[PDB]
Amino acid sequence: AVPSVQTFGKKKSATAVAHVKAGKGLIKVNGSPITLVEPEILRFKVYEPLLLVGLDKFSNIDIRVRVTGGGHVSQVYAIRQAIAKGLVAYHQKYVDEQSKNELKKAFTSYDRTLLIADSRRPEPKKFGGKGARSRFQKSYR
Amino acid sequence: GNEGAIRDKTAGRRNNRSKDVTDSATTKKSNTRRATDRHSRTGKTDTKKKVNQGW
Amino acid sequence: TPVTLAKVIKVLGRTGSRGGVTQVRVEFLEDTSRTIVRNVKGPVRENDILVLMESEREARRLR
Amino acid sequence: VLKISTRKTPNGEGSKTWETYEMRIHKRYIDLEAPVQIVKRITQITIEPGVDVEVVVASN
Amino acid sequence: SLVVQEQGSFQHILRLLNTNVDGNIKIVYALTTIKGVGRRYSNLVCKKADVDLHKRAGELTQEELERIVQIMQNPTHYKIPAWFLNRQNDITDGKDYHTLANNVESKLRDDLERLKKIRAHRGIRHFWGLRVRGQHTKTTGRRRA
Amino acid sequence: FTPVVLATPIPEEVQQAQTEIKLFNKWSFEEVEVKDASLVDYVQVRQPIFVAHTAGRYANKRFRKAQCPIIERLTNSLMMNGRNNGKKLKAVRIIKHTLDIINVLTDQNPIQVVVDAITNTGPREDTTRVGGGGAARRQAVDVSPLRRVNQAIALLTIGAREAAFRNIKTIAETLAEELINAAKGSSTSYAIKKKDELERVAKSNR
Amino acid sequence: AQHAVILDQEKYDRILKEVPTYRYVSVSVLVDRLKIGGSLARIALRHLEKEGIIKPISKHSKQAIYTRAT
Amino acid sequence: GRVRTKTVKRASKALIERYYPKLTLDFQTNKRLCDEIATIQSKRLRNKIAGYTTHLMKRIQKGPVRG
Amino acid sequence: PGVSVRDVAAQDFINAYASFLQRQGKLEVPGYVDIVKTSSGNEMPPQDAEGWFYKRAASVARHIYMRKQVGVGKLNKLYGGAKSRGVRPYKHIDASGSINRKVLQALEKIGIVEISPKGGRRISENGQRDLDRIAAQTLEEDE
């Protein structure tokens, strides 16, 4: 029982839950440092919240994340969201508002949708094609 | 029997391959009356009294 | 090569029977105050800047 | 959700119109610690045509 | 791996198993042009011959090759599992062979004849120059013969 | 750069550049600029990013396509020809190598070279098939800046994919090559030839 | 079967005497010199790296990059 | 397309016809007015009506509106 | 400072574990290695050819260390890739339940895994020991 918040992040169908408890600055993802998230070209996608907002700000907290669902990309876009939504949820309850509204400002001015969850989602396919818009081929005899 | 089967000349790939294709192969539908559908064939024609009786 | 810069003044509409062509009046930035209406190819909005390859020639309705 | 996907045509003619019916099943459970007097009062009453009540016992 | 500096020892095209083998290609895949021996079989043999797979064909000191032939035409005396082989339960003596690079042409005939000579419907189907594994002959296979 | 070390450690090279200048993989989104008039407002450098993988709603409105980081619009057009649809991670890696390749030759900050190529290949004017009756002549037109950029992205990427086909050289090398030869055209890049010949035929009908 | 799937001692010297002035050196660079096939071209890369001539600036398979030593 | 049907516009007409001493230029309160003043069978329909009584309200304040 | 294997890049860990089981010799490999295929959905044997039992054991070890318990039927499904069915569409196919059952056994006799209850195989208390060791040795090359 210390200062702590839990937050989530949802890309396509991935969800990334992230508890933000007061600590000595660690950031784990399902079991592992944020330096081992590899599909690895996107590595700086999940570092990104740390660098937009300065590598400090974590020395008083510990972040842990576990992602279920999604895929090798959808999960990477969901953890960064829960990491940044949580770093800004922590300044909600514990640090004051002006610090928090500086953080929303420095994310949304960059915002690869870091606090705002992307509404895009697979459209249902309908009979007559392999896709949702695509149709089967025809011939007119 | 199966003896006659392989012994039989005039059989197997080579034989047919050496034959001209019938032109009935690459035909069309031939359609056989798709454009006299509306012209009834019964030659009868239901009257109008037997219609007004019914309906 | 005498190159000619020309800011789009106004959107006038789609010419060309297919439609991929748009009628637009432009204003050059060097020596403004004289306008030319040109036929564009790509999608165009107000205040874009067109590279007129030759200056003194304008077009009208297309087929 | 019990899906059933089927062509509308009895025959084969026409564009291939498909059609899927569904039947949704809602299953609740409520755990009660009670004596015999209520559970038997509560099984006879609160019957409803079309709501299948099932009462089991034994935490084992 | 390494940078090697072979002398004039390495040779270009070399002949074995009544065939010809390209020297400047890897030895595992060099043995493939020999008929009846393929990727898997060539691999296991070279492993069994205690030979460096990284070597090309033009490498392989003459001792190594003579070994590689020996194991190919006797897989059962050198522990190759008798399901690694193209002819098991033969048809007459029931042994387990591996037909190799000119005999495989012979044994296709040997087999195809055993069917024709017996009037099995499969044979008849071969003699007619058709497909025998049962595939529909309406649409496919029109250029072939 | 005032480093800070917490429990699970962030590497020095990582710590260093990130909170510093907000630059690319390890390239500078700074002084890179467009050596031309419009083709400005239609190249994205500033704003900067780290890698060119952005789930951006760039299509659901007409012109907002022009807000995508141009470097990423270069990649997006690599990942195609059917077999490579999707496969952005593939592409995203091809660019990093290309830029690094282009970096080695002619130092020239490479995200600026990518700019120079897109500029130097967009056909300024072009032609369409006006009716005229049966026998259709060609009316010269002046192509928009957006179509100028778009066409430069396809033009570059295609002939380089076509180069890297059936040959020992890779996608990144051929992509690097065509790009480099397009930073100031050299009559040998598949692109420049098309650009030049789209302003040669747009000239012959005027 | 087209020229230099082997070492060809003169070719070793070629590599030692020609890699200077290569601003870019990679697999496709080594073959383009009427020279080594891609396999032994890939072995030279870690060799010329054993000391000196090349600086490894790229990382991995499917793309290598080296640069003149300074 | 976002052209409101008649029943929306017809309702807005009928409401501004007889409850002008209410229904400020704010939709949200117009919404909360509609529940108590008119019987509407669905939130979506009621929102669509109140959103339009709002518009018609807002331009009356500058000049009349015919109907 | 303290070390888990989850602190190590999954690739170089197994490679470091691969060299270990190699350098050691207390292995119990089957012997049909170099001739087996590792899945029906494969064309060629592995290229390690003396090895790849170390690599898989090391892989197998890490995977079971990461969770409660798994079975041979699970590793079949994990290590199984897509089988080209010639002219027919690709399909996922499970891998050899013999390589894996023998990898499980050869690691248990070597005391890195035990037959967990609830079914399966559990990470050995002695495997925890030896894994976090070589993991800590892996972050030694990076000091």
Add this chain to the structure above:
Amino acid sequence: PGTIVLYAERVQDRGLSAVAQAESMKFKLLNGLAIRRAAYGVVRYVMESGAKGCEVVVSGKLRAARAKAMKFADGFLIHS
């Protein structure tokens, strides 16, 4: 025997159940009523039974070889 129990029950004002009035058409045209009369009365009884609307359709063939059909509808109905 015993574990199943059946109870008849008068239906409340049949003139508002489709199925009832369908089997009434049947038990008119079989009893020989004029098709227009038969359908038109059914519509009248359903209406006097207090419906918002009713609609009877007869399809098939009466006395004439050809097939025809007839909508018989009165009052209010919606369809979507």
Add this chain to the structure above:
RNA sequence: CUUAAUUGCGAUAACGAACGAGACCUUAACCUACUAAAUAGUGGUGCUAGCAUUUGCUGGUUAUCCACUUCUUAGAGGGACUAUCGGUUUCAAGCCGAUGGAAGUUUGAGGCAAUAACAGGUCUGUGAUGCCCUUAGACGUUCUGGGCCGCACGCGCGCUACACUGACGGAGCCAGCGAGUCUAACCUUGGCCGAGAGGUCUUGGUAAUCUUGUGAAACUCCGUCGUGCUGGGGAUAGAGCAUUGUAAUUAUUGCUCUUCAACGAGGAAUUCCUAGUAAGCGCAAGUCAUCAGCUUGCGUUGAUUACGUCCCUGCCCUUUGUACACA
């Protein structure tokens, strides 16, 4: 004029309504607000393992306890009305841009769908049916076997490819829609044996409980090969082993070795599509004893180019001609 819409604005011998479009319904999106959940899951604590030791980090423990409902579930509500502001416009319906917003392309995708027409298809779905035919050497029915797969060829839907954005080999390793056995043998974990396919011993599940985290595939990582029909390609074919079934020959399917074809991007032509869409990629379900290169859905990776017009084609609308009205 506007709209996706007889959608409206406006004009107005019309005024004011109804069917149909809209509304409505279903699903996918937003709730740290409401009601809780050992068949969902978190934080604490025991009990417990490993590494560092400095308090840490990383796990185990279908009830050793405590509390919570952010995550999952589904009830009740709420939320959006193209809002606010601004351009444009008969300053009308509306439209366009900007901010805000989960969401502003009918929010996205469907379900429902008036009047009418067709000699459209279906008597081979029906113990729906008129008439005609047949009805014991049967056109009834059952049983044995064969055939619907037959092969000079023409056409259509597809699958797999021509490689280096690649094959292959190791390693990383991530979804969602589903189904699943009583008077019975469905979905199958785990342990063994087997190279493989499989086999054998057991086991959980009538199911958010067990199969299943369906560890799927593309994909990501390190290697091998190096442009050569090559290790691209996997047709044809020989030989062996297995499963389904009373039965596998004209080879149901699966596995192993071998054999290694055409195909070097495709003439005239022609199909589909505007955002989580196209394309690539697998999966579940339907059929199913066994067999998917099919289909219905599903998630995963994820673009390019329009955001226009009537030129091509197709269809609606007026005007107009008619000796047509079975049109």
